[PDB]
Amino acid sequence: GGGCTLLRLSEKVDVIKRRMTDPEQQMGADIIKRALCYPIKLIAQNAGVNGSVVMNEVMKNLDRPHYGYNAATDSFENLMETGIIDPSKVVRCSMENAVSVAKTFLLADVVVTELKE
Amino acid sequence: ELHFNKDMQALKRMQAGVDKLATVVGVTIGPKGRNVVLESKFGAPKIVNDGVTIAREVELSDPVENIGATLVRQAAARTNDTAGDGTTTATVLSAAFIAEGMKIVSAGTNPVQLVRGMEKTVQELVKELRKMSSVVQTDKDLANVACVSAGGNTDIGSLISDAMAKVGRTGVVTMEEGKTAEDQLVFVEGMQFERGYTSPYFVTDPERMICEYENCKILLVDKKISTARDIITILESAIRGNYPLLIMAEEVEQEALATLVVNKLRGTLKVVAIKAPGFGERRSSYLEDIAILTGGTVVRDEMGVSLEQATDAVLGTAAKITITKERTTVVGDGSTAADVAARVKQIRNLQMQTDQDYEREKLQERIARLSGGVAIIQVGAQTETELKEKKLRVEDALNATRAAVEEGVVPGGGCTLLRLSEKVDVIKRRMTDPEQQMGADIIKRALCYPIKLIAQNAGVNGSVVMNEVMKNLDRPHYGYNAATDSFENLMETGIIDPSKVVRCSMENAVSVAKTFLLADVVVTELKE
Amino acid sequence: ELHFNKDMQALKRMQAGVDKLATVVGVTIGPKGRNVVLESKFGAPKIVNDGVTIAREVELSDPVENIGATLVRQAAARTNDTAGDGTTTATVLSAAFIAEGMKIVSAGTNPVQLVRGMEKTVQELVKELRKMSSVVQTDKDLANVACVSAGGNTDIGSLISDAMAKVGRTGVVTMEEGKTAEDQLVFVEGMQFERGYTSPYFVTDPERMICEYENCKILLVDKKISTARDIITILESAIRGNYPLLIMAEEVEQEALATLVVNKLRGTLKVVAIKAPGFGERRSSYLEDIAILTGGTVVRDEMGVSLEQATDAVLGTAAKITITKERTTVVGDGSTAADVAARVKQIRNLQMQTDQDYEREKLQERIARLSGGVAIIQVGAQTETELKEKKLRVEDALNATRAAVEEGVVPGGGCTLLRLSEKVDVIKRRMTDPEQQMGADIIKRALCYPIKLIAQNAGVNGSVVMNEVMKNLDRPHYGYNAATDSFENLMETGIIDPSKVVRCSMENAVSVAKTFLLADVVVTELKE
Amino acid sequence: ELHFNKDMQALKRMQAGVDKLATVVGVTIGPKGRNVVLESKFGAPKIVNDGVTIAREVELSDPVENIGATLVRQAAARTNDTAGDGTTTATVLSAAFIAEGMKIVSAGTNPVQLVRGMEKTVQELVKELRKMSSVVQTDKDLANVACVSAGGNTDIGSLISDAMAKVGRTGVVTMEEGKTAEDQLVFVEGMQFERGYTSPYFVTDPERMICEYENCKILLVDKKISTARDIITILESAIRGNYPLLIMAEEVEQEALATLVVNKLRGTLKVVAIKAPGFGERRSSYLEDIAILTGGTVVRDEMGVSLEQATDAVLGTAAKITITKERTTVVGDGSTAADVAARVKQIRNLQMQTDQDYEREKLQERIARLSGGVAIIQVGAQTETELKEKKLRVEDALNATRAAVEEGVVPGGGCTLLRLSEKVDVIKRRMTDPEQQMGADIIKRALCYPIKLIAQNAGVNGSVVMNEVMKNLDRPHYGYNAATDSFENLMETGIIDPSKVVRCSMENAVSVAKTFLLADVVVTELKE
């Protein structure tokens, strides 16, 4: 948990070369990358600490040994053994739905609305 | 249909509303307080000297600064209905923590570590406040405490003293006027509980907003009530004998509650609504404990009789009943006194065979209030405006004495807030981050505000008064009486505050200041 | 006709203007600095990468925030003409102290103890800066410093190295272009002083604003000058031979000064103004030290000849003279070199018979500059634009090398500000009042700003950069070069700053922040 | 008195102004270009089909978008005076780099790496353009290139062909009309230099802004001139004989220059001021190289005769002199032709004994221009409007032929931009950061703009045009002539552009786009 799983997910779109590798789809991949960076940034920031340095410490270190950052205690700790864990169902559903509404958002080009008079 | 308020200025907005509330209640505080004029609903205006009445009526225009002042009103009201006093102190301290809070926060300081510092500081200052407290253990010192806390002369405070000297602990003393000019002490079979009414619309006589009824029958069950036709038949029994009815069966749903308040608003049916004591098997063991005490059987389905009709056998009787916000009291009824003398025997038998721990203290708290009973006191009568003036004085006397004997006693005049303030300087916290230290200094400078406002609005500089007491030794009960304007010891003189008031107002003020500075976004429904 | 600006908000007004000045100069700083487009006075615009030019042109509409920005410009300009560089660093530091300062003052903190904490912190940080400094004592390490400090390749920086390896101390190296593509070193009879021009209107060629004249006569008297009729006869002596004239006789009053600038503006008379070196008997002993050095006599009334007609040998000759803001230099004249070799003998004579102390060092500072002379260097020429680009590169090279060897050298990139910032945490001051501690933390967070603005406007987060540098050992010259974006030691790589610049910009920034936060009331003339 | 513009929107303001300039110059481009109506200073309007006249006159109200458009005007003007043509191409490309640049920058992309990508991509494309270029080495193919580049028929372009076939390299061919209808080729003793006149106020006949004089004497010294009394005596020597005078002594200061332009504005004295060729000892070796050539001695103070008076012996003669922005040409004078034939012998002698390297090429560049001389051509005359129409057609012909033979030739129509644009897709840079790749793609989409605007304003979709040219093989000189609206090889048809124009307009466009996107803050002096 701690939204750190979104960083580990974001740092695996750099290895995704798609078909037919048109620059636009690559932009969308970079879009997902920078968008997954936001949640942990908001968590660390609104807690009271710079999120840029936290993101740097976790990412530069090995991403596999469950390295993470607990904002509740503010210290370098493994999220598993400490007790900060998130259900994968929540992460998956919130991620798919966010893209689903972003789909029907950016695709939009004309909006109508019934007015008062 | 929702308005948005964000950033740094949104906080300042409701802070101003808070500061405006603490401004009018601020000039209320002090022995030489000022008069606040209120525009009447219809007719001649009402002059106010109380901080409670002011906090009740204040509500501004701008919604953000309106919910800000109301957010402090919560702490003020909550402090009042849990300590009996200290609304003025709660508000001014609340705004003090907020003002000094916003002052430091504006320097880009982390709110989380600040509020953590405040929480721990006041918490240790509460632990320190218990050390500061002066305990009463003798009925004669209790007499001196009572008579002094009572307005003016002793005598009447000397009457309350022996009134509670009879019934040792667990209360509960109730007062009433009439009928002939003497001091009539009366002890009868009465009981109380720490539950409250269902709706604040049952208040018999404002502004006391306390529901009192004389010569009324009682009725109670354990299960939830929603059906009405059963009570309608009992309503016919309440019309059969034009008398009010008592009901306290845990949760009454919106249907029966609406029928109750409608039949009460017209005056056709005098009804009372309230909750059940305890939980689980305790409920069915508490209502049956008060059933026979009131001279009535139990209408539970466990045996079980529960139908449309209801006679005198299923409902007990109570001469007088007085219920308030968090308390419900019964007294006066001349029913089976042996029941009160036999149920206590059953508790002793159960406690003798009890191996558990929770059952020991539950039987201990039940044997307490049972044995304590109710004691009701009758006041004298000189003129028609005399006991009315007395009854109010003895009302404020009893509540003050109870609040004092409950948690202990501390030197009043707001000086106890100074002594508590000059002990945060030695507090080295963990992990001693600068932010938490700021919060400690915030508590320090905030505790300074009440005494300053007291002296200032009295007519003298508070800076010199604070300097005279602080530089002098804080231990020999040194203080400053604003009533006489002289250096005196607050204990021997007669200026004392109940420690319950100081603690509650302090904790609540930090409580609202916690959820005030922690806020960052405020929403509000708008007109259009 | 006078406007009154008071309270707390009047401070924030000029703070905004200060912050606006630091905003534009802020994006100027750093190796990956940004361009700032200036509107032309008439025609094609002018893009600027320097922080000096920007600070010259900035002046806001609102008077209060204009004089506030102008107040910072004072420290910026003063740093520029006392160190040679660091306008960008002085400004951002000045605003840093002001921003962080007012951030704390807003909490009602005592300004007096705050600025006291600032002054002492930076002063001990200057004493610490001298420890941080690296000293050059060998001409070969001086060669490596000079070449690296020079732009790009060495060769020319390797030429200035031996140029100052010849003239050991006291300077002073002066440069000039022409005529054939080689490296021509020339040592001749030249001298300089630490005085300046009378008026900034004498500047020959802006934006260098340095008055340079070739093949001109020089005139010196010790007393003050106010009369004109004597000068207009020398003007006739300056018209007889169409040549410029040099004058530095202490104080020239408004009358003669106005006549001088008027006759110079029309181009009829090429005149130069300036001031006198030393004081009292020193003046009459310094002007006669340069009179014969320029091949002229003294027109003092002590002997004394002083009439209307002045001739050829009452005024010395100087082949080339270059003067600036706080310096005045002469060079080139092929006069009595024996004088330069005989006056030094007279100084040694006075030195050995001297029993005093001040006379010993006055003779020592005079024998220094006299023996030092003025070595003029001639650069080569590939094309016509290459010689100009070189001349500018060697101009910035010489001024950088001089500013480096003068006060010592410190690691550049603004990283030395962090190493200094992480030494205030150990500073336990007297009497350690919290306010002075706030001032220390203010300096800390303020010294953090420059490196942040450099990294940020370069294109990378400054927080991570600060962390990586600070968490690592601060002693093995660890640093971060924004030009390459990589972990590197600032020394071996070639990113160095002169310690004189850091110190001057630091002290001045605190100096203006001193007179900024101490302010409480501001006045200003209005239009109507 | 200074305004402040910052953030992202400040960039878009001047970007709009740039977009407005490229809008009017945009409809100018193309064979089927449109007419731009200009309001006259006084009287009948002036229609313009040239992009040069438009770029001169355009200047908007809003200062920021004015200095933005002017910033592009600097690129267009600089391209014009360094290539001879391509103002329209420079502007549309400049705005292309800006538009496509800001289009990517708005995504928060690093400006530093972007412009770095732009610089390197276009620089390698310059190295690529030199590959795309076609070379001319035969006078007969030169004849075909010249006649085609010339408007319409050949004959006259076939005359310029043999005109330059005579004088091989180093130029320089000058033209003139009159007097009898034939083809008169004339070679005489003439010379030129790559220097320019002092002030643009000396222009004889606009809009050609080129100062031309007939039958005038010359005068040159090496030292700087500031005095005037010597000049006013030569003025008297220029008044006794009503003839203009030539002066080129390096730097003429503000005094003499002001006197010169004043005496010229009244028509009493026909003067001009020009700079010195070479540098140092070269100057004194170049002015005496043109002194005797013009039949005059040297007035240098190196020995050295220089006083008040001046006669015919100190000043040479010149039949005709034509000077422009960056060139100064003399021709026609019938002086010592033996001088031009003897100084070349002296150069060969010095060349034989020269051991250096720079002296060899300096003697080589002097022996070149000396041997090349200055061939002047005379055109025929049918009517009076035909000779002027010819003279204009041969003026643009000569300038086009020189620009084509100088840097080589490339297929015109802006199609060479596509061939250059479809070569950035193979450019893998270092360290191949995405930003530099964006800058490469920016260059690609920007090079697509000119050909698109050409086809569009002509009257055909540019999308299908780009498709046909690009999808086909880019090597067999495939192109699209908008004049005939048809598939055609740009070489064999007659639509060719000089490589110098394409290269210079491309480099300057990136240069101003460099100092455009790098900008982040813009300042501007306001009215009040």
Numbering used by the authors:
A (entry chain H): 415 to 531
B (entry chain D), C (entry chain G), D (entry chain J): 4 to 531
Q: Please, what does the article write about this entry?
A:
Though the authentic chloroplast chaperonin consists of both subunit types in vivo, homo-oligomeric Cpn60β is functional in refolding model substrates with assistance from co-chaperonin in vitro. ATP hydrolysis drives the chaperonin allosteric cycle to assist substrate folding and promotes disassembly of chloroplast chaperonin.
The crystallization of functional hetero-oligomers of CPN60 did not succeed, whereas the crystallization of CPN60β1 homo-oligomers was achieved by the sandwich method. The crystals belong to space group P21, with 14 subunits per asymmetric unit. In overall architecture, CPN60β1 presents as a typical type I chaperonin, with a 7-fold symmetrical cylinder structure consisting of two stacked rings composed of seven subunits. (2) The structure of CPN60β1 is loosely compacted; a closer view revealed that the equatorial domain of CPN60β1 extends away from the central axis, with E1 (aa residues 2–136) and E2 (aa residues 410–525) domains rotating counterclockwise and clockwise, respectively, in comparison to the equatorial domain of GroEL, although the overall structures merged well. In CPN60β, positions 153 and 154 are occupied by glycine residues that have no side chains to aid closure of the ATP binding pocket upon co-chaperonin binding.
